[PDB]
Design a protein around this ligand. Structure first.
Ligand code: HEC
Ligand code: HEC
Ligand SMILES: [Cu+2]
Ligand SMILES: [Cu+2]
Ligand code: NA
Ligand code: NA
Lengths: 147, 125, 105, 382, 125, 382, 105, 147
């Protein structure tokens, strides 16, 4: 399985602090086992995923993850290089970063995280060929974002 | 030589237009009027901003980003002219346009073109 | 008048203060377009790509004359301590399409 | 010592007269000549002199292939020409000590016959955009009362000069857009980085009114810096690195994208044909045709000279003809009269080859046109 | 042709340097920039004073005094350059010196060289 | 585009070295270079650009055949070079509209290393004599504190320029004499129309004391506009159209006419050999030798290039050598050190050919030196 | 002004009345270098050779501005009427070594 | 005998005004009869001729007759064509011209005039071949004047 560490101090992420709701979803399991988020570009999830990101992130990161009060999340550059993979991105939300970006394990369930993450990926404006967090089939149906 | 033929870079003479760091230079090679491959000639003003281009280095097979900064405050050197456009984009994509006089930031607000240097500012794709 | 330059020329990113306000630059853009700071802070732009970038405030923003900051190469920084309070719009000299803003409250 | 057939005949005919004049008892009494009245076949060649501090513009009678005058210029100046031939002008730049010292941007206006400056309007704070000469980076409004120039720094702007009252008006704020194509006394469109065209109506005061059009070209399509624009037919012909053409009808005062056309054939594009040069396209209004400089070349040598010129029906995109110029041509243009002339300027030879636009045959030439002539300009009269 | 060989005048093409009235012209032939054998081009200023020379006319075998007046107020035409010196004397004999910028008397005090005309002002020896 | 046999050399060296810095991870950090300290092998090349509105001077290191700097100029500027290498300067002219408008005459002084201007002294009412560049039509005083320039119209005169104090002093009324050869801080000689020499002594104010020497040459003996003058050795070498050489010794503060000498042999003058070019004569102080550009030509082709250069003993007049330059040379000069360099400049090839003065063999060359390079200036150091 | 110009352009010498004040110009010289006349007189210069010659008075001599007389071709004349006593020097524009003066009494 | 008229009003020159002293000399006799001035380039005469000019003509015509108050007398151009001959030159001196130039019969004798004339012609700066008042032996012997 994947290594789930705090992107900052290196310590292992303690999943005992994870709320009990949404730790069972076939997505949360598949993710913890494989490290793959089955919600990426998932038509039956996006609508809601977007809403999660809407009232949970758009405030600091922008209406399209372009950036505002906080950094941009819609391009190939990542202050924390690991975020180019869902395992790293996950660890970021769960364990926190610095400043007004602290551990989400209190407000989001393990499933709501993977959904929100899925939308953040959908907002990617880069080139499909680059979307390394996507299977081949998904890279084929992916179109860089545009409001 | 054939002007329309593909550009073939070389890494053995910086005063020739086919020298690899010049793949997108427009104007004159500073090394021909008192400057060097990467420095302005005496009396000229060194610009800070500039256009760029990813030039392939036949020596190590790597590609580097060249920042074509202009040496200004002097009339065109008239020595060693070159015009290459590898990856050169129209003016609406300034970051890669080389018809622009890249003299912004030069001391004393010099805006006249004299020659261009070919310094490496990083590795490219 | 409305800010100062802790360092005239760009310095290696390594020397950047941990926890210090930072606005990374990459993929042709100021990753943090509407940075909000309070009087006294020292915003520090840091370039992350090969394409050279800088910060440029027209005349009348951070003072009488315009501030044409220096071009930062990959992994270089440039700081500005905002003295007065208010909104300060800037841009990259060679890339007029790269806008930024630093609201000081 | 090298003279073209045209200037040799001119020279001979001139000797003939001076000889007969002498023999007939005529005395020489030097005076300052007036240039012949502007006409369709009058052509203007501007020499940027590879970015020199001083430049020169050659006034030519394309019919006779003779130089009827010249106009001096500063650093990378922008030349304009009233279509009705009433006047000519330019936006220039000069420094107190050659290429150094105090900078001064200004606009001069010249009598089309005496070439005497009739107006010298200074521009505040060196606002001119110093770049390789692009015709549409400084433009004349249809009425010929206003000149519009572009500004790249500190931010995209377009200055308004009141030619009539010989005075600078103001600097209008515009989006990331480039080029100026006036359509009305107070309106011009610009090309934006986002692939859209921008309409900028402006008045005597107040922020201008701006509106964008649909994006008309993908991000990986590159529109050359030298589009052809007929202010009379409201036609804007814009080529790409591959020859694909984007025509935009502005005659209605609003953008209206026409059927994109491919200047080069399927066969050609396959065999490596691509447009290349400086002023790559030309458009004849009356015949409603498109002229394009093309040749076989690698995809990044888009600024080298071309040896061929193809002509297509701007309407049907049909291939009308393909001419073998026989020289390294960097720029082309045509006279707008009934049977047009096809001007083919070579920066390398500092020569202007004047052909017949119908057959593509070279009629005459004019050499010694500066150190690196790049822009041809003709007026649409009538 | 041979630059050092004796000057052989011709009377059939005023745009060639071997045209007989140009035996002591320095600069450019005005007829090549909008003027004529004896008139300045549009926009230039006609000088009154000038240097002279006795040029032989192969047509009638007579020699005429040519007054090489300059057309001024413009940068060198750069078209049709010639330098002949039949009977040209050093600067201490100005009346026959052609390195001097003969723009004196031109309107608006124009003193920049553009081109030179070759008008006849009388018969010589 | 061609590269001189010395250009490739310098080009590869730069490559090899850059490639190395790269391989060693040494980051490129651009700065404004300074030129190497002036030395005996330094040589300046001025390009009057065929009387173009703006001109250029090329600072060249004659040893390596490399351009180490350049300085912009105006209309037909007069250049000067301090023999001690402490500074360079020139009398220039610019206008407010390229070649028209307000005229402004001035003197500029430059730092031989930074090539930055240390002084910009304006000259009242355009006093400069606009003529093809004659080195001695603007000269320095032995102590390099005053600059003297000639004025032709409305009457002969010389202006005094205080370089040390950076300001125009005054105009000196002089007889109908031409050229300037400073022999002291307050004294200089001139060549007069009557064939005599004029001695001018000037104070800080009041009419200067002028005295004429004996007439040293017939009315039908023509002294070229480019005589060689070695201020240190107070030697004045003045050739005539035929190659006859008048020598004047000005060391004693007064003109002492040395025995004339014929630079071309009896046989040569019989076959039609005559000097010709622009800077036709050079004089090497230390060796006390004369170098004259010569070739076979008609008598009125004195301004055409020559392919030969003969060397003679200044004192005896003994022929020492006759070099075949291999090119059309217009001007020559020499470096004033041990084994001097024979500089040969071609206005046509815009190339400076550097030869071994001793052997006459071409060591290297430098091209693309402007549009019509004509004047070579060296410094007599040590 | 000290003088008025009868004719702005050179005119045919054959049109000069015998007896009129005249200064011939020939052999590169003004035949009468120090002409003396009375106030009101009109002096007429006549070029007698092929070499063109004019008369040139620098500024402040015959008035605020300098009088740059037109070049006379052979057999052409130029006139000037002196209205005030004094000594007015002149020279030939292209031949500065040619000088002369008019003494108006 | 050559006609002697006043060069301006054409009235015959009256010799009764001539000083009685100095009409006899062979020169005067030969001159009046053949319009020839035997003194032209006569070494024995030149010394006094130069002096005769000095006290009488230099004041108005210059030290070397290059011209001053009156027209120059040393070149080929004459305000009065006749002065290209000795009969004409004589007529001018004897009868005068206009302005300051008056007759000389009161201050000079016929012989003294011919002598002064000889000095004037000696100041000629043109080429010998042009001295149309000289005789071969005088031409080849005479050399353009120079101070
Ligand atoms: C303001 C209170 C924020 C909200 C709401 C969200 N984020 Fe954030 N985020 C914020 C800051 C100030 C920072 C910078 C942290 C640093 O020290 O660099 C971040 C950073 C991230 C990152 C890291 C991206 C990178 O540059 O590598 C990620 C992946 C991220 N934030 C995600 C994220 C999500 C999914 C959010 C909604 C649930 C969200 N953030 C909200 C500030 C704020
Ligand atoms: C001043 C009082 C004079 C003296 C003494 C002499 N001359 Fe003169 N001379 C004078 C004038 C003002 C003129 C011009 C007359 C005119 O009508 O233009 C002259 C002219 C002559 C000429 C005519 C020359 C010509 O160009 O044809 C001659 C030959 C001449 N003068 C001779 C002459 C001699 C020999 C004199 C000494 C005895 C002499 N002049 C004295 C004024 C004066
Ligand atoms: Cu940028
Ligand atoms: Cu004269
Ligand atoms: Na990002
Ligand atoms: Na005379």
């Amino acid at each position: 399985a994947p290594q789930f560490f705090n992107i900052i101090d290196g310590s292992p992420l303690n999943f005992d602090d994870a709320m009990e709701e949404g730790r069972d979803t076939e997505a949360v399991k598949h993710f913890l086992e494989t490290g793959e988020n089955v919600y990426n570009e998932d038509p039956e999830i996006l609508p809601e995923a977007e809403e999660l990101y809407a009232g949970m992130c758009s405030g600091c990161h922008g209406h399209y993850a372009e950036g505002k009060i906080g950094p941009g999340l819609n391009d190939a550059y990542w202050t924390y290089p690991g975020n180019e993979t869902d395992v790293g991105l996950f660890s970021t939300l769960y364990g926190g970063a610095t400043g007004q970006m602290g551990p989400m394990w209190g407000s989001l369930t393990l499933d709501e995280m993977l959904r929100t993450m899925a939308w953040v990926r959908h907002l990617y404006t880069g080139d499909p060929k680059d979307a390394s967090w996507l299977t081949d089939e998904q890279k084929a149906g992916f179109t860089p974002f545009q409001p | 030589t054939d002007p329309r033929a593909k550009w073939v870079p070389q890494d053995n003479d910086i005063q020739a237009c086919d020298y690899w760091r010049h793949c997108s230079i427009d104007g004159n090679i500073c090394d021909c009027s008192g400057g060097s491959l990467t420095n302005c000639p005496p009396g000229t003003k060194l610009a800070t901003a500039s256009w760029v281009a990813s030039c392939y280095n036949p020596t190590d097979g790597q590609s580097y980003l060249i920042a074509y900064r202009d040496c200004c405050g002097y009339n065109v050197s008239g020595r060693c002219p070159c015009l290459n456009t590898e990856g050169e984009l129209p003016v609406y994509r300034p970051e890669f346009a080389n018809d622009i006089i890249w003299c912004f930031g030069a001391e004393d607000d010099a805006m006249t073109y004299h020659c261009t240097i070919s310094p490496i500012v990083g590795k490219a794709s | 008048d409305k800010a100062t330059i802790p360092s005239e020329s760009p310095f290696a990113a390594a020397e950047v203060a941990d926890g210090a306000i930072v606005v990374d630059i990459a993929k042709m853009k100021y990753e943090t377009p509407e940075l909000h700071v309070k009087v006294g802070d020292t915003v520090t732009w840091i370039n992350r790509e090969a394409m050279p970038h800088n910060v440029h405030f027209v005349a009348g923003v951070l003072g009488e004359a315009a501030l044409k900051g220096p071009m930062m190469k990959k992994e270089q920084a440039y700081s500005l301590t905002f003295t007065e309070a208010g909104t300060y719009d800037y841009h990259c000299t060679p890339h007029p399409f790269m806008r930024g803003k630093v609201v000081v409250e | 010592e090298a003279e073209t057939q045209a200037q040799e005949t001119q020279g001979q005919a001139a000797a003939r007269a001076a000889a007969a004049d002498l023999a007939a008892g005529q005395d020489d009494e030097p005076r300052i000549l007036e240039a012949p009245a502007p006409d369709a076949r009058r052509v203007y060649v501007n020499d940027p002199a590879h970015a020199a501090a001083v430049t020169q513009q050659f006034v030519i009678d394309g019919e006779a292939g003779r130089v009827i005058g010249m106009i001096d210029g500063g650093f990378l100046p922008n030349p304009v020409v009233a279509d009705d031939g009433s006047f000519i002008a330019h936006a220039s730049t000069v420094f107190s000590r050659i290429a150094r010292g105090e900078r001064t941007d200004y606009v001069e206006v010249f009598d089309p016959v005496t070439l005497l400056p009739t107006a010298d309007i200074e521009l505040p704070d060196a606002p001119r955009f110093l770049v390789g000469t692009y015709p549409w980076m400084t433009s004349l409004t249809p009425d010929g009362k206003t000149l519009l120039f572009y500004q790249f720094s500190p931010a995209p702007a377009v200055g308004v000069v009141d030619l009539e009252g010989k005075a600078f008006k103001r600097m209008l704020d515009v989006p990331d857009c480039y080029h100026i194509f006036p359509t009305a006394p107070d309106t011009f469109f610009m090309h934006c980085r986002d692939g859209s065209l921008a309409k900028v109506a402006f008045g005597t005061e107040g922020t201008p009114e701006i509106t964008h059009t649909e994006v008309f070209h993908p991000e990986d399509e590159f529109l050359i810096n030298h589009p052809a624009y007929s202010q009379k037919a409201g036609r804007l012909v814009w080529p790409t690195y591959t020859g694909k053409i984007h025509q935009i009808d502005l005659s209605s005062g609003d953008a209206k994208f026409l059927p994109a056309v491919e200047a080069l054939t399927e066969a050609e594009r396959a065999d490596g044909w691509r447009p290349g040069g400086w002023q790559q396209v030309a458009y004849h209004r009356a015949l409603d045709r498109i002229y394009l400089l093309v040749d076989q070349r690698d995809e990044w040598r888009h600024k080298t000279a071309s040896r061929f010129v193809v002509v297509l029906d701007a309407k049907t995109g049909e291939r009308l003809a393909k001419f073998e110029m026989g020289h390294e041509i960097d720029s082309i243009n045509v006279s707008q009269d009934e049977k047009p002339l096809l001007y083919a300027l070579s920066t390398g030879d500092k020569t202007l080859y004047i052909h017949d636009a119908e057959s593509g045959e070279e009629l005459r030439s004019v050499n010694q046109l500066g150190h690196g002539p790049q822009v041809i300009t003709t007026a649409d009269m009538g």
